[PDB]
Design a protein around this ligand. Structure first.
Ligand SMILES: [Mg+2]
Ligand SMILES: [Mg+2]
Ligand SMILES: [Mg+2]
Ligand SMILES: [Mg+2]
Ligand SMILES: [Mg+2]
Ligand SMILES: [Mg+2]
Ligand SMILES: [Mg+2]
Ligand SMILES: [Mg+2]
Ligand SMILES: [Mg+2]
Ligand SMILES: [Mg+2]
Ligand SMILES: [Mg+2]
Ligand SMILES: [Mg+2]
Ligand SMILES: [Mg+2]
Ligand SMILES: [Mg+2]
Ligand SMILES: [Mg+2]
Ligand SMILES: [Mg+2]
Ligand SMILES: [Mg+2]
Ligand SMILES: [Mg+2]
Ligand SMILES: [Mg+2]
Ligand SMILES: [Mg+2]
Ligand SMILES: [Mg+2]
Ligand SMILES: [Mg+2]
Ligand SMILES: [Mg+2]
Ligand SMILES: [Mg+2]
Ligand SMILES: [Mg+2]
Ligand SMILES: [Mg+2]
Ligand SMILES: [Mg+2]
Ligand SMILES: [Mg+2]
Ligand SMILES: [Mg+2]
Ligand SMILES: [Mg+2]
Ligand SMILES: [Mg+2]
Ligand SMILES: [Mg+2]
Ligand SMILES: [Mg+2]
Ligand code: NA
Ligand code: NA
Ligand code: NA
Ligand code: NA
Ligand code: NA
Lengths: 221, 396
RNA sequence: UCGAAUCGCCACUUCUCUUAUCCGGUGGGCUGCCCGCCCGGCGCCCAGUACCUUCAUUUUCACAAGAUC
RNA sequence: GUGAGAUUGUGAAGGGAUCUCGCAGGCAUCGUGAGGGAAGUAUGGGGUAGUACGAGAGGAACUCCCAUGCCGUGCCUCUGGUUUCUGGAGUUUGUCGAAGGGCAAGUGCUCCGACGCUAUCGCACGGUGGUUCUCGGCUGAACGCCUCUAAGCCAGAAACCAGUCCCAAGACCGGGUGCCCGU
RNA sequence: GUUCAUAGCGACGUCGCUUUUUGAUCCUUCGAUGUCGGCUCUUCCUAACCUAGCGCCGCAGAAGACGCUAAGGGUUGGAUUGUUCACCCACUGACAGGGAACGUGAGCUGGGUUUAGACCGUCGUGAGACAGGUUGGUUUUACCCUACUUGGCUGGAGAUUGCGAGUAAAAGAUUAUCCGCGCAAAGCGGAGGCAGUCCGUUUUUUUCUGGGUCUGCCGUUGGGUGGCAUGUGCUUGGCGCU
RNA sequence: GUGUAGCCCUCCCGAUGUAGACGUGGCGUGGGGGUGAGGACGAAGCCGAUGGCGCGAGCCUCGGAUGGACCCGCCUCUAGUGCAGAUCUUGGUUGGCGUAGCAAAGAUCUAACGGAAUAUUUUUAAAUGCAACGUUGGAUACUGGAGCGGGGAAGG
RNA sequence: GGAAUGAACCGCUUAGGGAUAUGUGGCGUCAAAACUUGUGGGCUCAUUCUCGAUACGUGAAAAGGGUGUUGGUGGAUAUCCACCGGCCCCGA
RNA sequence: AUCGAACCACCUAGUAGCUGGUUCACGUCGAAGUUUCCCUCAGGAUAGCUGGUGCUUGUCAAGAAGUAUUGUGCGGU
RNA sequence: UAGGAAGACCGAUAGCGAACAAGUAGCGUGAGCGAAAGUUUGAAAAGUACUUUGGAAAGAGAGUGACAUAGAACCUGAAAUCGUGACAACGACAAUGGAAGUACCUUCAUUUCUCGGCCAGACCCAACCUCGCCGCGCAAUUUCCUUCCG
């Protein structure tokens, strides 16, 4: 994915500087794992580019002990003759989500393999996607719309930590820094936000009165 | 049907595959856990194997049958010329592992270090590090170095130093390699700022083994074992031989699997490469830390044996020669043949047992010849047994 | 060298938390009702809501014959 | 566009047209670690102690200390085994005239024998944290009593997961660094 | 079971599980799937013999009985017999039960079973018979594909193509138009000058050029101070040189 | 005017199928009787990213930088008349494959000569002509008189 | 054409092709259809062969139990007893 | 190189209810594994199921019907 | 033993075993068994003198002949299998196959070139098939609606 010299010369000759394709960034905090994967799988097949973040905050219905036992039963399956050929049991939350999505795709055709290549999964919000725009959610897979309040659920990050994931503390430290850095900057840049709101209110007093009457009729000001 | 009688399986399945080691030098895969309370210090060293001998000492072990009595213990002698520190590296932690941040190089480096980056040094242009030398000390070069050191302080997690051996000072006739061996040594203890301060003071300087290890301490050994080439199942795995009347040979495994599954499994012994594997062994006590013979010649003289002698046996170590530099005496054996490069590291397992904390006081060191049955400790002793010989008569 | 498919962008979006929750926050009076108080944006044809000015013969659809990289 | 080539079935110049390939990396080092493998396990003695308990008869165990069995990873200082160093010596038959030096008997045979390889027949070494099961409890309703359970919490098996250990980027590392080349 | 149905048992009855016994059937194989046992080697199951932790007793202690989680580890040396099975001697913490084409013959062995020679008993007029006893009786082929064990060579992200552009990177005239400190702050620091040329839609325009020059710095001429493990490179301090 | 390149135009009802039966102005091959053509300005045969026609068996055209002397359409007669397999017959070719191997009877060395078998380079000597053969002299060693000694029979 | 898979089950039975509509079976992704339909009711929480979920297909299960939770019937008193169902749990 | 009956040529292409094979296209139709007899049970003959050729006729229906209704008989699950 | 007539016969794996130095070569102690093989170059040997490399075999030229890719067991010269030049791409589903398109070739067939038998779009008539909008009949709408009191 690192550009070669050939790409650099071609871009320099034609005067191309930067390019960003159309990508949707999904915040997967407090989303149901199975329902989020099913919706994402169909959109990938329709030709969308999707990047998901905060995969460690996905939720699964049931107690943690029940889901932990479920994973351990999966870990027991291996090719006895040569386990290095057998099924591979990935342990990170982003790898678990990618495996779940892969099971909902035609993975043994070129069309299915291409669709899987269009998905990128992260733990937390990495520095290269922080400033890329506003994140989105999936209302049909949100926890407060799917589970009854009295049921018990499992957070994917806590489940993975006890079956082999080794970077739970690293992700937690990185998230704390990001919240501090983003919170400071958003406390800044408030004077400009207030100034812009004040300018709009100062308008409707200098702008033509006929256009003000139209705005009132349509309920805009 | 079940097997008629039970016995434990042959061999350890955690040391697979039994393939040739990728490198010939011993490399530590992990370093001891960092303790920020202690002072910054190095954690490993590189030495060369010379040979073996044995010693006599008195043991202090209450409740034992040998308490306050003499024992004989074989030991291993390893030559340890001082190392040179040339670089600093820093690491940062990411959700996918550790990543290198950058490298700070020393301004002056020796020819033996720069020999490592060439296949034919004497017939090349020898241009390595020439451009960096022209730029490092300028105003822009100083600014670039400060930028890298600022990155180390701000966001690094682990600090390591790049060091190399001095084969020129180890004037061995049988070790043919002239390019130095390069490795990384982690710095443990103190904060990140204190770690960097120690590394800068160490740049372009020598480090002696006595400043890393102490006598009566334990250590870990990383080395590659002796090779044996293609080997049968009897030697490779230790299976039992078959009766004498066996058609088509008896040094085999009779049954290599059942009908189902219809394939051979990875747990069955087969013939292949044996030896030349990387191994890490634990808890080797340090019996002596000797200094170079040029400074103090009475290396093998103890408080109970006043004979003046060096550590090299009569006639020299077989296939190695003389020990001319600092050395370390380890109890027991270490992997690999003579002349191989071996890495010693600080212990990983807890060190609190009575055996591990015992204080060692040597009483006798053997220096007889390892060729034949040596019966003279020194050259003077042999010339006292024999009188003047025929050749001496010619001289006088 | 290359003729190519893609056709919103922002240094107001590009911080956080909740849903048994003051749906912007936050008090008082007598369960629940009543009464208070303070505070996404642009973009679609004049760089701006005036009514000034060039568009053709590419003469009835055809990948926008134009843009971006 | 440019640099190379090709257009091979009934002959030779010359021109044209078209079709293919190249137009950017190379070598050398220090590292990361997803995934896979996975290992240590038992007994005895000292002391507790002739103690607890028991009318007597009899009769235990934990911290701690010292060894050993089975297994695993290595090594050759010592001891033992092995000799085509045909090393040194000795000895039989034949043979070069004798002696000397040898030689033939697919290594004549005997003794000692280095280097190397090798034996529990010799020697060294074999770690750290969590989640839980059975079970025992704490608060506590349902059910103005009670209750280890309904919500919640504690401690916790040779079991399970990770660390240490072995292979390791078809796990395609936008990890670092050195020099040459190109833009 | 001194009493006491249920510590431990449990008749008369009744409900199940398993495929490690033997039967019942005859679906596949008769232009052939090598038929007992032992040796060797790996793995799986739990209905737990020993090893870890527990509950309960007709558990005072010691030794034990019953039950729960648990298959990580261990489970022997011999006499007789072809034996599986059986039965004794001995050690031990313990000498648990089973599966994998009744695991395993192009891995072995060939004692037994089941050809041809021969002896005995019983049966048959006889040739001969006996799931009765006995002795002697050729064990063939891998260089192919896969699996497994080691051993090397080498491409490749549109997983060989597209030019089909997503960094677990930075932080701004849209990353361009310099650096250092600082919180994506507030704020505060440093920066050589002169002449041409060659190109140019403006803001002290881009380059290329020339001397005059001043730091940091190379390679140097020699000189003396010194450190390092002491033949080889450094730190000094000047000289004239980019 | 059963059956076609169906005499032509409307309308209605059925259409699969093992063993098996039957139909076809249904296809193809060797030869006889008739009729009509073709060929050195090139017959049969053979080759094909040569297309066209037919549901199909097949038919026809094109090209040959192939060939060198015969052959076909239509109506009828006649038969040794159509192939993918029979552990089918006879030839040819084939992966395995430069593979498995060419391992009893002890063994050869050296100089000169001979030989086309060298001392073979244009683009100092070694790193660019290797390997192997016979005779003679010398060396080493085997057969060891029940001999890789010297003569005969049978057989040749 | 359906029941993932199957000679015999379900639907339907077949000249070469379009348009329209159905049968059996379905409408979270694989995979066409409720881009997870209703402005419809209830019931269920199930720790190592892991609650349950398309008949034929026994092609996985009993006797006997539960103060789990949700409904009935018959008696008593200003809540108590006896009996019978649904789903789930032990037996496994 | 042959022996619980040698070798060569011939009768001999010996017989086989048993195993193997059996060469172009389209179209109209399209089954049976059941009955009786057979030294019959891995085979035949015989009736049934099928194809071909028709004959005699009719055209809304004769000697039509795997179906009802009405009337009248039979029966021992 | 001499001759004649022929054939809806076979046409070199056929026809006699034998179209040829065939009951021959070869096999078996013997009685006996028993093949393969068209010399079919060309009308005519005119069967390649001579130069050059090579020890030779042969190669490169030259020549005869209408043709030598008719060069000597030489007419025609198929398939199986192999080499070479150019090109097409291609992961690992063993290949092969069916259906429907597309990207590059091919220049095979047919049509057209001032009218076209080519490619699109809109409009008109008939037929068939949909959607909007507006409604009706019936004691179905009295186990009902409303007011007041008990
Ligand atoms: Mg066992
Ligand atoms: Mg044998
Ligand atoms: Mg020695
Ligand atoms: Mg792991
Ligand atoms: Mg594992
Ligand atoms: Mg000798
Ligand atoms: Mg001799
Ligand atoms: Mg000896
Ligand atoms: Mg068979
Ligand atoms: Mg067989
Ligand atoms: Mg077999
Ligand atoms: Mg069985
Ligand atoms: Mg068996
Ligand atoms: Mg066998
Ligand atoms: Mg056997
Ligand atoms: Mg076998
Ligand atoms: Mg016998
Ligand atoms: Mg039909
Ligand atoms: Mg048929
Ligand atoms: Mg004929
Ligand atoms: Mg025939
Ligand atoms: Mg044929
Ligand atoms: Mg070979
Ligand atoms: Mg051999
Ligand atoms: Mg001899
Ligand atoms: Mg001799
Ligand atoms: Mg769909
Ligand atoms: Mg016949
Ligand atoms: Mg047949
Ligand atoms: Mg029909
Ligand atoms: Mg009869
Ligand atoms: Mg013939
Ligand atoms: Mg020819
Ligand atoms: Na044998
Ligand atoms: Na159990
Ligand atoms: Na002789
Ligand atoms: Na049959
Ligand atoms: Na013949």
């Amino acid at each position: 994915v690192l550009p070669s010299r050939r790409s650099l010369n071609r871009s320099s000759r034609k005067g191309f500087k930067k390019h960003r394709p159309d990508i949707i960034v999904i915040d997967l905090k407090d989303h149901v794992l199975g329902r989020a994967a099913a919706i994402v799988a169909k959109q990938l097949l329709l030709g969308k580019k999707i990047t998901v973040v905060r995969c460690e905050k996905l939720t699964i219905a049931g107690s943690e002990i029940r889901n932990k036992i479920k994973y351990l039963q999966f870990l027991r399956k291996r090719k006895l003759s040569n386990p290095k050929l057998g099924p591979f049991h990935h342990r990170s939350p982003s790898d678990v989500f990618i495996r779940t999505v892969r099971s909902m795709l035609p993975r043994y055709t070129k069309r299915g393999q291409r669709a899987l290549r269009q998905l990128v999964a992260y733990e937390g919000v990495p520095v290269n996607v922080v400033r890329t725009g506003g994140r989105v959610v999936i209302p049909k897979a949100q926890r407060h719309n799917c589970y009854r309040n009295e049921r018990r659920f499992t957070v994917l990050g806590n489940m993975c930590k006890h079956v082999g994931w080794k970077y739970s503390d690293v992700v937690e430290k990185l998230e704390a820094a990001r919240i501090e850095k983003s919170g400071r900057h958003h406390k800044k840049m408030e004077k400009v936000r207030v100034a812009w709101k004040n300018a709009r209110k100062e308008a409707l007093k200098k702008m033509p009165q006929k256009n003000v009457e139209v705005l009132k009729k349509f309920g805009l000001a | 049907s079940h097997c008629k009688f039970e016995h434990p399986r042959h061999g350890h399945l955690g040391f697979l595959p039994r393939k040739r080691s990728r490198q010939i030098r011993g490399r530590a895969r992990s370093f001891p856990k960092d303790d920020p309370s202690q002072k910054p210090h190095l954690t490993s060293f590189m030495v060369y194997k010379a040979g073996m001998t044995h010693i006599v000492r008195d043991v202090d072990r209450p409740g034992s049958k040998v308490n306050k009595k003499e024992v004989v213990e074989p030991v291993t002698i390893l030559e340890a010329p001082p190392m040179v520190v040339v670089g600093i590296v820093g690491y940062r932690q990411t959700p996918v592992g550790h990543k290198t941040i950058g490298t700070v190089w020393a301004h002056h480096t020796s020819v033996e270090f720069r020999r490592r980056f060439y296949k034919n040094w004497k017939q090349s242009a020898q241009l390595a590090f020439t451009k960096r030398k022209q730029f490092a000390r300028t105003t822009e070069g100083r600014l670039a170095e400060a930028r890298t050191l600022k990155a180390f302080e701000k966001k690094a997690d682990i600090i390591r130093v790049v060091a190399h051996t001095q084969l020129r000072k180890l004037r061995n006739n049988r070790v043919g390699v002239k390019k130095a061996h390069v490795s990384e040594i982690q710095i443990n203890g103190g904060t990140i700022a204190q770690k960097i301060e120690l590394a800068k003071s160490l740049l372009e300087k020598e480090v002696r083994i006595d400043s890393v290890f102490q006598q009566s301490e334990a250590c870990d050994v990383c080395a590659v074992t002796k090779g044996h080439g293609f080997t049968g199942v009897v030697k490779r795995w230790g299976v039992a031989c078959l009766p004498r009347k066996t058609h088509r040979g008896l040094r085999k495994v009779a049954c290599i699997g059942a009908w189902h599954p219809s394939r051979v499994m990875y747990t069955v012994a087969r013939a292949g490469q044996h030896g030349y594997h990387h191994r890490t062994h634990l808890n080797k006590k340090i019996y002596q830390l000797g200094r170079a013979v040029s400074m103090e010649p009475n290396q093998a003289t103890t408080a109970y044996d006043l004979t003046a002698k060096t550590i090299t046996p009569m006639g020299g170590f077989v296939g190695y020669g003389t020990v001319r530099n600092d050395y370390v005496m380890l109890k027991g054996s270490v992997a690999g043949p003579r002349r191989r490069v071996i890495t010693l590291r600080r212990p990983m397992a807890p060190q609190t047992s009575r055996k591990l904390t015992e204080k060692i006081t040597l009483k006798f060191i053997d220096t007889s010849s390892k060729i034949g049955h040596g019966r003279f400790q020194t050259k003077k002793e042999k010339s006292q047994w024999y009188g003047p010989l025929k050749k001496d008569r010619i001289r006088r």
